[PDB]
């Protein structure tokens, strides 16, 4: 075939953690950054035991060996009760244009297939569900669980201009389904902004500001970084941070914020049982270790695209939406 490779058109930045009180969301200088700290942890024997271990003497022996570790932790201060998560989002047009492609015959029918898809059903639901996942706060991941209150401030930036698009209560919007009426005037302005940017009509740059009321001293949940037994350190858990040594700030990986944004695919076989999942070529969910959209039940990105392009096996309108959502997510495809 061809060795294509599309570029992501959703470009979120890392989301950095900031701490303050709830009554001062509008006051931008009222939010100090959250830095990582280290603390000692006395481990516990909690994993399933091996076949050998069984015997009470060696379980017991295991419990007396110290098992102590050091972990990263990020928390709100004793006097500040509200996490603040800020990141910018860039939506780019050109979703139908490959950035690389090795078969001249394959490129031609692809762009046509997408172009007329764009032409027919304007990719509004793509923008609508992206938009929705800003308003859910789904990109907060573990920080939304247990929140007293979550208010999300979205603005558009152009030059030196900021424009309030919307202030969404993340807990007033569903995570398991997408609202299809009566939405909101403010939500809808933001789905049309993202769709315009997806399409090419506008230059779109958003500034998200999520505010979670967690309670003084409460632990916040940045991303994890994985580099175990790196020599003398031998620290148990490492969190993610941005900005060099003392200044560095706790953050969620940009791609984790992205993974949340594209969790849209309600269009796969078991979609009513498992709710929405994140658009991936093979509808893979890493936690559950299973692939919705298996290749044998031809509903993966790949089988569908050849059908829809190489053979003109037109697919259903939702699966058509899905393969657009992969091209929006993008990635080397071969």
Question: Which residues within the stretch 152-191 sit at the binding site for a second copy (CB under 8 A)?
Answer: 157-160
**260 contacts 25 by C-beta, under 8 angstroms:** no
Residues 227-246 that bind a second copy (CB under 8 A): 227, 240, 242-243
State the binding string over 126-155 for a second copy (x if CB under 8 A, else -): ----------------x--xxxxx------
In the complex with a second copy, the residue whose CB is nearer, 93 or 315, is 93
Angle between helices 317-329 and 124-135 (to 10 degrees): 60
| Count of positions (residues) in the chain | 334
Determine the interface stretch with a second copy among 115-123, 132-140, 182-190, 252-260 (rule: CB under 8 A): 252-260
173: nearest Cα among 157, 155, 186:
186
Query: Positive or negative CA dihedral for 12, 263, 145, 150?
Result: positive
Instruction: Find the part of the chain contacting a second copy (CB under 8 A) among 42-50, 125-133, 175-183, 313-321.
Output: 42-50
Here the tokens at position 305 are 């695209």
Least separation in angstroms between residue 290's CB and a second copy is: 6
Helix (H, G, I), strand (E, B) or coil at 171: helix
What is the closest distance, in whole angstroms, from the C-beta atom of residue 136 to a second copy in the complex?
Answer: 17
Which residues on adjacent β-strands are paired with residue 75? 219
Instruction: Tell me how far the alpha carbon of residue 154 is from its chain's centroid.
Output: 16
| Residues paired with 303 in a beta bridge | none
Nearer to a second copy, 174 or 243 (CB): 243
Measured from the CB atom, the residue of 98 and 166 that comes closer to a second copy is 98
In the bound state with a second copy, the residue whose beta carbon lies nearer, of 160 and 180, is 160
27, 37, 122, 318: which one binds a second copy (CB under 8 A): 37
Q: Toward a second copy, which CB reaches closer, 194 or 214?
A: 214
Strands 10-12 and 82-91, sheet pairing: antiparallel
């Amino acid at each position: 075939a061809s060795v294509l490779s599309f570029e992501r058109k959703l470009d979120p930045s890392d989301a950095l953690f900031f701490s303050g009180n709830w009554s001062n969301k509008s006051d931008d200088k009222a939010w100090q950054p959250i830095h990582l700290r280290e603390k000692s942890v006395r481990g516990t024997i909690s994993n399933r035991l091996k076949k050998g271990e069984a015997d009470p003497a060696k379980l017991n022996a295991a419990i007396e060996k110290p098992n102590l570790q050091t972990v990263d932790v990020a928390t709100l201060p004793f006097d500040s009760d509200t996490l603040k998560v800020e990141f910018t989002l860039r939506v780019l047009g050109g979703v139908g244009e490959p950035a690389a492609c090795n078969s001249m015959e394959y490129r031609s029918k692809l762009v046509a297939t997408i172009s007329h898809y764009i032409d027919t059903h304007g990719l509004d639901i793509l923008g609508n569900r992206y938009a929705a996942n800003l308003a859910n706060g789904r990109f907060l991941w573990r920080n939304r669980l247990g929140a007293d209150a979550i208010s999300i401030q979205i603005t558009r930036l152009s030059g030196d201009e900021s424009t309030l698009v919307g202030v969404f209560d993340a807990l007033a919007h569903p995570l398991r389904q997408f609202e299809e009426k009566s939405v909101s005037e403010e939500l809808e302005a933001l789905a049309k902004l993202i769709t315009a940017g997806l399409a090419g009509q506008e230059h779109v740059l958003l500034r998200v500001k999520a505010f979670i009321r967690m309670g003084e001293g409460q632990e916040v949940f940045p991303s994890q970084e994985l580099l175990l037994d790196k020599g003398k350190s031998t620290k148990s858990r490492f969190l993610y941070s941005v900005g060099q040594d003392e200044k560095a700030i706790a953050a969620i990986h940009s791609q984790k914020i992205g993974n949340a944004l594209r969790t849209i695919d309600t269009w796969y076989p078991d979609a009513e049982i498992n709710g929405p999942i994140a658009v991936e070529p093979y509808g893979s969910v890493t936690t559950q270790g299973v692939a919705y959209r298996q290749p044998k039940a031809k509903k993966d990105f790949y089988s569908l695209l050849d059908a829809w392009v190489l053979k003109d096996k037109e697919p259903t309108i939702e699966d058509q939406h899905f393969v657009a959502a992969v091209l929006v997510r993008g990635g080397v495809f071969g």
